[PDB]
Every structure is written in structure tokens, then in C-alpha cells.
Amino acid sequence: ISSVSTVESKAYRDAMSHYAGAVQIVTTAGAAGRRGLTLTAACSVSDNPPTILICLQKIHEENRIFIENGVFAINTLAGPHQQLADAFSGRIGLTQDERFELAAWEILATGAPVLKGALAAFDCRVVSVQDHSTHHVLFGEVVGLSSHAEEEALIYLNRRYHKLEL
Amino acid sequence: STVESKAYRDAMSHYAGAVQIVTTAGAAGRRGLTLTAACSVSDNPPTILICLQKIHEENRIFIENGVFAINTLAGPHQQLADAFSGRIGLTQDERFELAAWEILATGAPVLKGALAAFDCRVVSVQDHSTHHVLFGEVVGLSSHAEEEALIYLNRRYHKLEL
Numbered sequence: 001i002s003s004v005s006t007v008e009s010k011a012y013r014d015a016m017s018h019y020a021g022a023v024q025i026v027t028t029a030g031a032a033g034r035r036g037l038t039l040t041a042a043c044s045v046s047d048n049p050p051t052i053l054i055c056l057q058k059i060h061e062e063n064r065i066f067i068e069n070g071v072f073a074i075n076t077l078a079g080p081h082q083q084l085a086d087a088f089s090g091r092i093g094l095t096q097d098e099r100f101e102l103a104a105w106e107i108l109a110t111g112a113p114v115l116k117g118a119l120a121a122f123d124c125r126v127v128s129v130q131d132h133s134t135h136h137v138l139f140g141e142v143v144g145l146s147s148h149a150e151e152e153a154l155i156y157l158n159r160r161y162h163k164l165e166l
Numbered sequence: 167s168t169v170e171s172k173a174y175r176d177a178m179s180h181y182a183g184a185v186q187i188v189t190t191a192g193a194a195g196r197r198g199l200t201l202t203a204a205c206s207v208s209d210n211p212p213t214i215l216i217c218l219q220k221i222h223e224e225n226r227i228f229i230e231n232g233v234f235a236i237n238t239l240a241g242p243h244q245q246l247a248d249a250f251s252g253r254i255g256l257t258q259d260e261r262f263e264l265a266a267w268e269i270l271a272t273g274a275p276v277l278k279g280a281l282a283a284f285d286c287r288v289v290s291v292q293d294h295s296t297h298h299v300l301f302g303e304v305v306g307l308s309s310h311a312e313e314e315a316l317i318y319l320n321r322r323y324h325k326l327e328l
């Protein structure tokens with residue numbers, strides 16, 4: 001099995017279009033500045049201690065800001081957050097500052113922007129930074145937490161956004 | 167410096183997950199389990215990670231075999247997900263009996279009728295507290311045009327139209 005080729009990137013992306021993802025906006029703030037981006041490549045690693053990972057495209061050099069600040073917050077998006085998901089995916093242009101202006105943010109522990117009205121927010125300190133081909137994989141220990149009882153979760157699946165009732 | 171485990175788990179119930187069954191086969195035996203702690207790492211080369219609890223000793227079988235298939239579940243797969251979660255008993259063989267399986271590249275069981283299946287060779291195994299994190303390169307692929315995805319959210323299964 002070590003000698004066989006990996007599948008084609010296109011075929012893989014097409015298959016991954018069948019793999020739903022809860023839409024997050026991952027954020028950071030600190031000496032390197034404030035940045036956010038719409039993200040689905042994240043998951044929980046452990047509950048003890050609470051640890052989550054995110055995958056950031058290397059091709060966008062501004063993603064280094066997360067590493068430099070050594071903190072990030074994962075904000076789980078709800079029904080009313082389509083505009084924000086679009087802003088933070090680069091769909092509508094705008095500067096980072098202009099993108100943040102579109103909603104109200106607060107903080108938990110690290111200073112990374114936490115979305116008011118998020119389904120959940122996980123505020124993290126970076127504990128591992130890894131290079132995996134096209135992406136940095138950052139592991140974070142969860143040092144701040146919020147959750148709110150919103151009616152719907154924002155989910156990406158089959159190349160479009162969906163709202164799913166909790 | 168970290169938050170409480172329970173509070174974290176509770177917050178994570180607001181974080182939806184596409185339900186997968188991850189499987190393996192080889193010299194160490196055949197094993198499957200339901201999970202949502204997986205994501206795509208890269209498309210070049212196609213790479214996926216999975217997180218496996220240490221407490222379930224037999225998860226070592228994935229590491230020993232060095233292959234796994236991630237099967238993305240569709241609408242009709244709720245009972246199957248329940249079986250492979252260990253929450254309704256049954257031996258491994260009894261769990262596999264509840265569905266039809268095939269092979270792609272590695273010999274790991276691939277689910278017939280899955281929305282997608284990603285057949286992987288393990289390229290890295292990492293230890294992270296209570297879990298192993300396995301990185302797999304995708305060497306086999308299947309995809310089917312099923313109408314709904316099985317999603318876990320708010321401690322319940324959901325069906326989401328594609």
C-alpha cells in the first residue's frame with residue numbers, strides 16, 4: 001500500500017463536497033494584528049484537556065498572524081451569520097477591519113475576537129504548529145468558552161450553505 | 167489554564183459533525199467505529215486526519231494495520247451509526263453485519279451506499295493526551311449521489327438535504 005498513488009486532487013475535492021462541515025469563523029488578535037477567516041477544517045481532539053485543531057491554508061501568508069499571536073478563537077456560526085461567513089471567506093472583498101465591523105465582538109481569555117450570538121466559541125492558546133503540505137495545522141488548548149441557545153447551525157455541504165435546526 | 171471538560175463537551179454539542187464510520191482491516195483484525203472527530207487536512211496530496219480515543223484499547227488496530235477508510239454516512243445510516251458507536255452493544259462482527267461492504271485500495275471495509283468513502287494509508291500517528299491523531303493519505307475513493315447527509319448536532323441525529 002506504500003507504493004500506490006494517492007487519488008487526484010479534483011476527484012478528492014468532489015468527494016469532499018459530500019462531507020458536511022459546521023461553519024466557523026476563526027479569529028486572532030495580538031502583536032501581529034487582528035485577523036479572521038471562515039473555516040470548516042477543524043475538529044475536537046480531546047476533552048481532557050480540551051483541545052481543538054484548525055487547518056489554515058499556507059498560500060495565504062496572512063495566516064501566519066495566528067501562529068505569531070499564539071492564540072485563536074473558533075466561533076461556531078448560527079442561522080443569522082451568512083453575511084459574516086461571506087465576509088470572512090473573502091466573497092465580498094473588504095479589509096479585515098471592514099469585515100469585523102459587520103458584527104459585534106467581545107473577548108473571553110486570550111483577546112481573540114469572540115462573536116456575540118455564536119452557537120459556541122472556543123478561545124484557545126496554540127500548543128502545536130504543524131506543516132502538512134498545503135496547510136498549517138494548529139492545535140489549541142481551550143482556555144475560554146461560551147455557548148448560546150441559537151435555533152439553527154450554519155453548515156456547508158454540496159458547495160452551498162445550509163441551516164440546520166438544533 | 168484550560169476550561170472544564172464537561173463545559174467543553176456541552177459547548178461542543180452546538181458544533182455539528184458529519185457522521186462517519188471509520189474502518190480498518192488487516193493482520194490485526196477488522197474494526198469500525200462511529201466518529202465525527204475528523205477533517206480534511208490537504209487536497210495535495212489528499213490527506214485526512216482522525217482522532218481515536220485511547221480508552222478504547224482496540225483502536226490500536228487502526229495503528230497496527232496502518233490503513234483506514236472513512237465512510238461518510240447518508241440518511242438511512244442512523245441505526246448503523248448507533249451500532250458503531252458502541253451504545254447498543256453487539257460485537258464488531260455483529261455491527262458489520264448490519265450493512266454491505268466492499269474494498270477499494272487498502273482492504274479496509276468501504277460502506278456500500280455511503281455518501282463518500284476515503285480509503286487511506288496511515289502516514290503519521292501522534293499522541294495527544296487522551297487520543298491518537300492519525301494522518302492518512304487517500305489512495306482510494308468512492309462517492310454516491312445520496313439525497314441526505316447524516317449529521318450529529320445537539321445530542322441528536324439529523325438528516326440534511328444536499
Ligand SMILES: Cc1cc2nc3c(=O)[nH]c(=O)nc-3n(C[C@H](O)[C@H](O)[C@H](O)COP(=O)(O)O)c2cc1C
Binds near residue numbers: 039090
Ligand atoms: C465554507 C468555506 C470553508 C472554508 N474553510 C477553510 C479552512 O478550513 N481553512 C482555510 O484556510 N480556509 C478556509 N476557507 C477559505 C478562507 O475563508 C479564505 O481563504 C480566507 O477568508 C481568506 O480569503 P481572502 O484572502 O480572499 O480574503 C473556507 C472558505 C469557505 C467559503
